[PDB]
Amino acid sequence: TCPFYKKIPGTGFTVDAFQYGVVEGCTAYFLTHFHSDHYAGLSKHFTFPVYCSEITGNLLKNKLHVQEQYIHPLPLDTECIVNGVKVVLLDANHCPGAVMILFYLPNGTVILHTGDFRADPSMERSLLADQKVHMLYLDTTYCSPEYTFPSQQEVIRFAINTAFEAVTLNPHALVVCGTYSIGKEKVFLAIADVLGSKVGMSQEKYKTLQCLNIPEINSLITTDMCSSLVHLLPMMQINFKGLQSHLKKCGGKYNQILAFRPTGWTHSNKFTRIADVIPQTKGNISIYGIPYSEHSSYLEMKRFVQWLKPQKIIPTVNVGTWKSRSTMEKYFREWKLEAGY
Ligand code: NI
């Protein structure tokens, strides 16, 4: 049954609640982004109204075959009326098409649902600046002070410099980047740009990237692997066995692989600077774990909430254990006492 933290009180609405069957009294299902834990349950047989971004609606139609008549895409940064209630979609700085949702309840309550997000000071100058928020439904993925990681820009600098060095030393090296969902496209696109290559991938992944409105995409990606020296593979295949196997397939065009696994946090983060990261190596194969996150660090999360000053916080992540829940509630109280709201 649908958990309370997926329901918007005072409305007919749910958020990211497609795996529960027909939810009683739900008149409109919102979807924040196209990640499987959130869309779980949608298919071509769904016949209720789904509200989402344009990019998310491209993916619903083309990848899951949801029929067009039930897809309701909304523009961002634009006041819209849905079943009698004003809503706004805001960029969540997550994966392509990911949104936060502002609901303006008929009784005067204002609710922000972050979906999945990476908080940024740029958010302090969106339509959030304009009014008070009573209830915050918060992506608390990394809600503990041990979770530190660098900016996306520092991580991409490291990856570009690493790839460019390796391939300039050895023009016969192949670069491989792991993927299992949309998101983190900057990693492989920035590497292919510095090398003057397109990124090669499977037809299924090419299809997915073509739904994303990325400018000049036809110039950057391809299904012709042989013409490319940056290849995308499933994240599961980014290991010595899986890579040795791929290298066989390229028919002696290449004699070395440099591979990237963009993880979020790993506890190498509590000890090592991005500058100091080193790969795991076996023979002519090296694998770098790089901490490219599309969720808030603890400090980014704290700064956002202390700026917003919500009356009540509802976590949407890490809610299954009492120890997690109690940890998170302690930090919420600290933040409120330090800031004074
Ligand atoms: Ni997500």
From Swiss-Prot:
GO terms for cellular component: fibrillar center; nucleoplasm. GO terms for biological process: cell division; double-strand break repair via nonhomologous end joining; interstrand cross-link repair. Expressed in brain, heart, kidney, liver, pancreas, placenta and skeletal muscle. It comes from the Eukaryota. Its main location: nucleus. Induction: During mitosis. The mRNA encoding this protein contains an internal ribosome entry site (IRES) in its 5'-UTR. This 5'-UTR generally suppresses translation while specifically promoting expression during mitosis, when cap-dependent translation may be impaired. Keywords: Cell cycle, Cell division, DNA damage, DNA repair, Hydrolase, Isopeptide bond, Metal-binding, Mitosis, Nucleus, Phosphoprotein, Ubl conjugation, Zinc, Zinc-finger. The keyword Acyltransferase does not apply. Belongs to the DNA repair metallo-beta-lactamase (DRMBL) family. Binds constitutively to TP53BP1. Binds CDC27, which is itself a component of the anaphase promoting complex (APC). Binds PIAS1. May be required for DNA interstrand cross-link repair. Also required for checkpoint mediated cell cycle arrest in early prophase in response to mitotic spindle poisons. Possesses beta-lactamase activity, catalyzing the hydrolysis of penicillin G and nitrocefin. Exhibits no activity towards other beta-lactam antibiotic classes including cephalosporins (cefotaxime) and carbapenems (imipenem). This is DNA cross-link repair 1A protein. The lineage of its organism: Eukaryota, Metazoa, Chordata, Craniata, Vertebrata. The chain holds residues 700 to 1040 of 1040 of the full protein.
